[PDB]
Design a protein around this nucleic acid. Structure first.
Lengths: 210, 147
RNA sequence: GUUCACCCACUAAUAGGGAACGUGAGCUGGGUUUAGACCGUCGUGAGACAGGUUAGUUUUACCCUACUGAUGAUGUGUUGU
RNA sequence: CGAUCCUUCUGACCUUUUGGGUUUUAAGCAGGAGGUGUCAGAAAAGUUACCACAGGGAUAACUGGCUUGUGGCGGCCAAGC
RNA sequence: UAGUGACGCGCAUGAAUGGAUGAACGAGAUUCCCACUGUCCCUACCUACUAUCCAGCGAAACCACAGCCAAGGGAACGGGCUUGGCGGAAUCAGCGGGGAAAGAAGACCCUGUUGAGCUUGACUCUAGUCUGGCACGGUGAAGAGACAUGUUUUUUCACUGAC
RNA sequence: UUAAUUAAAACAAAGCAUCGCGAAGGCCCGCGGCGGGUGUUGACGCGAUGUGAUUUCUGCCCAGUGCUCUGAAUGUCAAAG
RNA sequence: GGGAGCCCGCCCCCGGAGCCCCGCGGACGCUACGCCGCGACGAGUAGGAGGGCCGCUGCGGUGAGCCUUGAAGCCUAGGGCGCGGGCCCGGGUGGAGCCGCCGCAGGUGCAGAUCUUGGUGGUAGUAGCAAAUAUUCAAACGAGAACUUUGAAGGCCGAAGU
RNA sequence: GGUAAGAAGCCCGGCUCGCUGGCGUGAGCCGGGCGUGGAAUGGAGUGCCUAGUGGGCCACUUUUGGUAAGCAGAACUGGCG
RNA sequence: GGUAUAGGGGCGAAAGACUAAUCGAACCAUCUAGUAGCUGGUUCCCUCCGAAGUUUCCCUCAGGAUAGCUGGCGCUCUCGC
RNA sequence: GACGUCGGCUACCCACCCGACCCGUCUUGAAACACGGACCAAGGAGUCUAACACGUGCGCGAGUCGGGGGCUCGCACGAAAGCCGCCGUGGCGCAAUGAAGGUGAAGGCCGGCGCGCUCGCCGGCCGAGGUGGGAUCCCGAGGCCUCUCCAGUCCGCCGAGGGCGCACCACCGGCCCGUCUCGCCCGCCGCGCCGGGGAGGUGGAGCACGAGCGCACGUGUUAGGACCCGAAAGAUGGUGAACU
RNA sequence: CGCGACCUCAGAUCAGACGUGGCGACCCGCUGAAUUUAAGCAUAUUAGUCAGCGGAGGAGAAGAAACUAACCAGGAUUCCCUCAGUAACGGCGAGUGAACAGGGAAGAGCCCAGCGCCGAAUCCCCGCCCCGCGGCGGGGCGCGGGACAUGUGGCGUACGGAAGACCCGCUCCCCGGCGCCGCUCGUGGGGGGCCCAAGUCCUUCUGAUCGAGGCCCAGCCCGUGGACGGUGUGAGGCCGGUAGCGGCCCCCGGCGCGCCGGGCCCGGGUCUUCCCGGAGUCGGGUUGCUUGGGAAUGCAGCCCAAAGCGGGUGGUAAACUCCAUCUAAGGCUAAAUACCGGCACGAGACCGAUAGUCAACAAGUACCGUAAGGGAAAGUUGAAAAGAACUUUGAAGAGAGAGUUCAAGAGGGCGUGAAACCGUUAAGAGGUAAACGGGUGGGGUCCGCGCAGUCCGCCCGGUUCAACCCGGCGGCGGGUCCGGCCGUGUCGGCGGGUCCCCCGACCGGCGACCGGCCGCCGCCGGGCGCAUUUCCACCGCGGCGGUGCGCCGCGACCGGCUCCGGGAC
């Protein structure tokens, strides 16, 4: 029963929720178990990075964000081909590869290629056997650093480019942002109608001749 | 704390603070929002007007990301940039007019609320209001559209 | 079944009433008033009838008081007359 | 003389119909109508004597309470038997 | 005011929702007569077993506190209150006036937006049943309507290879 | 015949009269099956009713509600075509 | 500061003027969530609020806490305090843990619910130990005999039987 | 039963008006001058959270139905609750 | 004695009779701590304030909502200064 | 008055006078011939979670936050505590109004250019308006004085009167969005069924120099078993023909 | 009229293996309601929930797009936060209710059919030899069989593939055995077994100390050990243990080195030629259930029923037209995930025997019902049985003595032993049932006095040192800021937006500190010998204050009342 201006609410407690209440008293134990498993995996892969395979530079859909840069699922096949890295060899070297990614713009492709180049530049490849074969790095850069890399390997940081103060001209002063926006919206709305009217006018023009 | 709760002061009182002419029955008025039209219509019409009835157009697969568009007023515009940027303004005898990127600060549309200081500035944003553009032009800046 | 009611006979007279419309751990259960049935009216029907008929378990006092009886009881020093 | 929801009609060079464009359709805004007579607006036939449960002396069938219309009984005046 | 025989004016008898009759029969319901007797007039006496007392063994219901009455008021019939009548230890055998005695959160009546059994011309439906359409579902022979200038509807008669 | 309030006028009974069915059937059971009971059966049989020994009869009414009959002479008539 | 008044000069400091005000320092009164002074008021169901140095249990701090020279608990015709919830001592039993203060937490206070469990009263040495005829005498064992056993007498079930 | 018993009131001067008018109204703006506006008593105003209650009864006076009612139903005030 | 029929089912010479002391729908367990506008109960002290059975709406009349009555928290100010 | 005499308000028993009907509950009305009640001991009924609303306390403050995760420990004390380019992905608030396409919160004064046209365009200035009531603060004439007359800077109290006027209330204006009416002009990459602007009414949970976020506590309302006990019923799955 | 192949189909106690059932906390596939809410009730809600059926593991399921999105795009599945109580569904009522993106935990990808190339190049079974055999393998020898051409194996699968040309660089991966060196993180991996510090020290209580006091420094010794339990109380040191990158003896696991038997002649980029897709399936109508999915989200019986620049999706039905994104009708896969059952552990602001699981104990036991099923009550002597020898009454149960124990005033259902109720002793009382409140009185229980209680506490009268100096020590306050530090605000060296040093000046000189100076106070040691000084006692009730052991009496003043006698206007 309502009483003197209370908020109208509908609690969703009409089912047998007490039977399906999920407590969280195991949260610290779960965190400890995950930490122990992570440390065990890090000790398992002694020279390999703790975080794991390298992740590519990826932008976001859903124009809500439209600007944030995050880690991708894996490097695209075209990016690997441009960088000169075989897709199967990349998995064994520690490069995340997914075969579903597309490449529409050149900027992302070039950024990922540069990232792969930098990773191969700062990659130390241990030989299969103690006697170093071809493509194995020298023993000089093996004793100095045989430890893991904490955190993500080459972390992605969203960086913005600073713009210096300009000399704003009369044209930029006379630019009409609101009017341009309204005109563009109107043109987008009426583009099809204008085309239909043009088609009808052309039909009338060709009918006049006949 | 039950020590501070009211139930400790009601020990010894027969009705326990719920009347004796009419006992505290289980559900006299109805469970939940029962009787929105009947026997609670007075309350529902004097405290929640517009509760019953439909209005507007349905939108099946609505996405908040499509309509996401945060707004910032000219009242707080120089707060997006560092204070030294405004210090290096109205100075140097050059007319620097620094650029403030609204999209970088996290807003898409710039609104015209508030008073803008007499200092030229280049405002880059996806959308602009007419009054905000007028204020910027009067101050001596320029509105820049970005995608 | 009756309260009521009428008649027969006697007689001074067969006057009128109350007591939780006296009186069911006092009695009877005759008819109201469970369940089974029959008849007539009403209802399509299940069923209804201050409309009739028949058969249909009447539990307990040893408690307190009241009453009928029986020992008794405080005083007269004790008993008896 | 009539709320919600639904249907129907009228009006905008009205909005959406979802990746864009055109046309049917549909969903929208505003103004009327279709009706809720239990009329602030449930969609709704009976019986139970085979009955059941939570309650009421707020509410009936007994007695007892106020009153005496009615029933019974008794006076006052006096046209007359 | 009952029982039996005739009258029909039948609130509201009546013909297989059967009417009338009817030998025998009925732990079926009523009226009268003979005999019989304590049903009664009108109660009395006798016997056995209890009830009584004693030895032994020994519960239960019920229990606000407890129990003498007249009147008054009260919530409208008091064991308690008021005014009076009065009252004296502990008990035994009866007794049924009172404790509005004990029992079952009244069977009657009403309320509940509580139900259940049953009925139907109540509101929604459902098994079942009838009919129409599609598939299993084929082969042969004729014929007709319609469209139109080959198509469909196909009606009938035959075969079994499905069933 | 209502064990535990109703032994009856109630139920049942032979007798009497209707109704469906000739087996890919009548009645009925079954979520289901080339299922099952009648049926180890065939109209003098099975299934569904009404009244309830013998005698004498069984009057009139199809308006109403049922049941049943045929009928491209046909108003309504869903899906499919 | 100047001019003067009903010959000039002082007219002074509380480490001391001694006090009904002393502005030089200031309680016996200052747990300032404390203390002190005036007035007015005090009914109460349903109900609300405030204070509990009222009470039960456990936890974090704290009483150089209590305790086998005696803890909790229980009883009391003893001394008391608080309006009150309740609390502090004395005595007796008891034998091993308990409490005060500052905060926290709760399965935290019973006279009723025909309340749940358990125990005990009046009734009450009361109702009752009454369906189917019936027992008696003597002896034995035995501490103990109406009920057992033996012997005798009288009976019943009366072959669809006890 | 409503009002008025003064500062939120009077007297001037000047502006505005797309309203109204022959000039004028009428309203709104600014500047200046004038204070105990009848009696008696009270310190006032304002904003939120909000339990319980929504069965009443009685009495002076007025009064509806009823013959009357310790009857049913109203008006002011006061009580029990 | 054996066997067959098992609960909206069985069986019934039909009484709503029997179906393990229960039958107008058996027993056990679970949903289930089913719902109740209806009964009953609701646990320590002191202090202060302290009510209503009235408005309108509701298939509303033993109940709710809404105002009213009430408590608490305050806040804005005036002053025996 | 002091070896069988004192005081013990309270509690043990008894007597007297007055008052005094048994508790809880429903009820206008209970001691009731209304209901529960022999007695005693133990247990016993407003809890917890979630969503809100208001008030209070604390921290930060146009910001606030730790949800989740990660880095320190082998857990006594610890499943605690500290820290994070995670410090903010994300929630709330800082912007609202329309069904939506969308739009989206400031003006005023002065000089000039168009005819000041209550309209448009160029520069400068002030920069959240005004009235009334407004706790407080400022100026404050003058008075009160001081052992004598004058002059006189200082410590004061009162101070008529005059002002800036917090918070808050009433009103007048102003601004944003939707809608209605009358109307005149602006711009071009595409001169169009384009876009923008004015005045006058109206609707909004809006702006008008902000107040929110997190935690804790108290009360009230709900969903949950929901202060405790209580049904007649309904459904699912199994067991009974040893009685009948 | 027979024999010999093949396709379909039976018999075997034929040879060798496999499934059945149970548990079921978590999971998967079906079926599946009603109590309840809507104040009634029928759609809805409860709810894909209870009940019922089937199937496995340590996890299961899902899983690498016929995806999400419309952006400058992301890229398997699973879980947490958020999206969000939102879009959406609903007698649009009650109520129901996702997904995208973003941030994290984890992260691993792949394999067939088809198309095609290779002499079926493949696989199974039986015999012999060698290794080894307690999760039956590897090699060799068998004109020994079978399966397979109605298709096994290698390459190869959408991310393209295959075959040639000829550019580049070169030659390790795995399996089955035989051994060997390092005891491999809770800091020695897992399991088992045995051990590792310090008072029973001196007094004192007790029945018994683990109590109390003391012991070269809170006390004696150890302490990387001061958790816990037992022992006749409350124990770091009496014992077991506890701590420890402490010690010793065995078994197992994996990570590494040597040897044997082997299998294995395994690449990347450019160019040329070919190839590349799962059918009664998608889809359409339909109806039923479900979903937020709304002109139909998903699952489906029935009917129709495909195509290949094709098909699906793009959250409003249809037509036309461009786009964006995947490749369904085949399959495998750990991780972050859940776990009221099972094995073994740790912990608690939880209950402490009417509480906590029904069950602390011979508990699903006794017992009840024919059965499905229902289901209790029940802990405590004592440190140690030392559990009462023996005498005596009685047939015995039961007592009376005696004895053990600190205690039977603990005596085998025995710790503490309350209330209701009952028996007995002591006191009091008793004809208006009992009982209660207010006011007294009487009798008892003890309590506090006293063998007078006149309660004291200050001032005054009738053995040494203050007074006053010397030396030492300590303390307080103060200014010339005296001198140095310290310290706040400003000015200065720019000396090293926020953060540090120097001298000079002013101000607040702030309790932020010192060295000298002064004044004062206190203590110790010396003088100071007695008109001062301080003690003990008495005769004064002399001055002051609260008080009297109990019972009282009287006087004066005031306040509040009820009265009386007068005089005068």
């Amino acid at each position: 029963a309502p009483s003197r201006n209370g908020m109208i609410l509908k609690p969703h407690f009409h089912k047998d929720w007490q039977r399906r209440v999920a407590t969280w008293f195991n949260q610290p134990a779960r965190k400890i178990r995950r930490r122990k498993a992570r440390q065990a995996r890090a000790r398992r892969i002694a020279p390999r990075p703790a975080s794991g395979p390298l992740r590519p530079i990826v932008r976001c859909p859903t124009v809500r964000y439209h600007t944030k840069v995050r880690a991708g699922r894996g490097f695209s096949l075209e990016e690997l081909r441009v960088a000169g890295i075989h897709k199967k060899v990349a998995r064994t070297i520690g490069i995340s590869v997914d075969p579903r990614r597309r490449n529409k713009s050149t900027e992302s492709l070039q950024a990922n290629v540069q990232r792969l180049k930098e990773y191969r530049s700062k990659l130390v490849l241990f030989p299969r056997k103690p006697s170093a074969p071809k493509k194995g790095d020298s023993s000089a850069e093996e004793l100095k650093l045989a430890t893991q890399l904490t955190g993500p390997v080459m972390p992605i940081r969203n960086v913005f480019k600073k713009e210096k103060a300009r000399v704003i001209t009369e044209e930029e002063k006379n630019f009409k942002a609101f009017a341009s926006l309204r005109m563009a919206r109107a043109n987008a709305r009426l583009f099809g109608i204008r085309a239909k009217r043009a088609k009808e006018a052309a039909e009338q023009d060709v009918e006049k001749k006949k | 704390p039950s020590r501070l709760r009211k139930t400790r002061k009601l020990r010894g009182h027969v009705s326990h603070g719920h009347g004796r002419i009419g006992k505290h029955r289980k559900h006299p008025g109805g469970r939940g929002n029962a009787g929105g039209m009947h026997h609670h219509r007075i309350n529902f019409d004097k405290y929640h007007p517009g509760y019953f009835g439909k209005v507007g157009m349905r939108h099946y697969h609505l996405k908040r990301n499509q309509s996401f568009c945060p707004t910032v007023n000219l009242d707080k515009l120089w707060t997006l940039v560092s204070e030294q940027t405004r210090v290096n303004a109205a100075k140097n005898k050059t007319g620097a007019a620094p650029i403030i990127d609204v999209v970088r600060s996290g807003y898409y549309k710039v609104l015209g609320k508030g008073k803008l200081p007499k200092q030229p500035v280049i405002v880059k944003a996806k959308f602009f209001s007419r009054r905000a553009e007028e204020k910027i032009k009067g101050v001596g800046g320029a509105c820049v559209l970005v995608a």
